[PDB]
């Protein structure tokens with residue numbers, strides 16, 4: 121049974137609700153982005169209308185085989201009528217194709233569902249500037265002040281400088297980057313660009329990247345591993361055993377690996393600066409964990425909500441424990457008393 125925080129009141133709509141069977145009353149199923157916890161349940165046998173971005177709809181058709189007649193892609197930043205209700209899709213600053221959804225209810229209530237997002241001051245000049253929001257369905261993944269991490273630009277500067285130094289010292293070093301979902305493509309694209317290389321990968325991952333409308337992608341990626349000195353591997357293989365095994369496969373072309381694991385937050389964030397980050401090393405293998413986040417830090421989240429001034433907040437993450445729920449409710453009240461709404 122579908123939980124209440126996935127239902128939009130006064131509509132026939134649900135958000136990220138595909139694992140509950142046929143939801144009673146639902147006339148349109150929205151999908152905010154192509155991450156498995158959100159699309160869980162979708163397959164080629166799905167026969168209800170799915171509303172989403174163009175990029176999400178490319179992935180639904182090619183990766184999950186959803187039939188075309190049930191995929192309804194909407195352009196961003198554009199007022200659209202769905203089953204009698206005005207909606208707008210906004211860029212969520214998450215992974216490729218990820219959206220927030222503005223719903224203009226027939227009774228005058230306005231609802232924002234963030235999906236998964238990384239709040240940014242640029243959102244204060246989107247179509248959100250133009251009217252009041254009564255209810256906010258909020259990605260609360262990092263809703264606690266211990267969750268700090270650097271800008272995406274600082275993290276990419278660290279990765280590029282680390283990779284270019286290592287490979288210039290040793291032209292026989294291979295760079296490997298972990299992945300297990302879409303998102304975070306800047307990590308491996310920025311490193312391959314500084315090295316003058318395409319990124320090499322499996323046929324399955326190439327297929328996925330080909331759905332993402334990235335400009336000039338054919339110039340940046342390949343399935344020919346031998347021609348590439350940046351390789352992508354499943355995140356589960358980013359360990360000393362998995363990397364040793366991969367180096368064996370490269371036919372004595374390389375004699376060193378430098379590997380990156382883009383994580384979200386880790387408690388090494390509470391002490392160490394990005395500048396001071398060091399790898400784990402065994403022999404000719406070194407592994408860097410880099411804090412590249414596609415979710416809001418605590419401070420970014422607080423700024424967004426204090427700007428928007430919603431009348432009611434419904435969290436969509438960390439909702440399963442009483443302790444998490446009570447923590448989140450306390451911070452919402454602080455924010456509201458501090459700003460005066």
Ligand code: NI
Nearest residue numbers: 153155214236
């Ligand atoms: Ni996500």
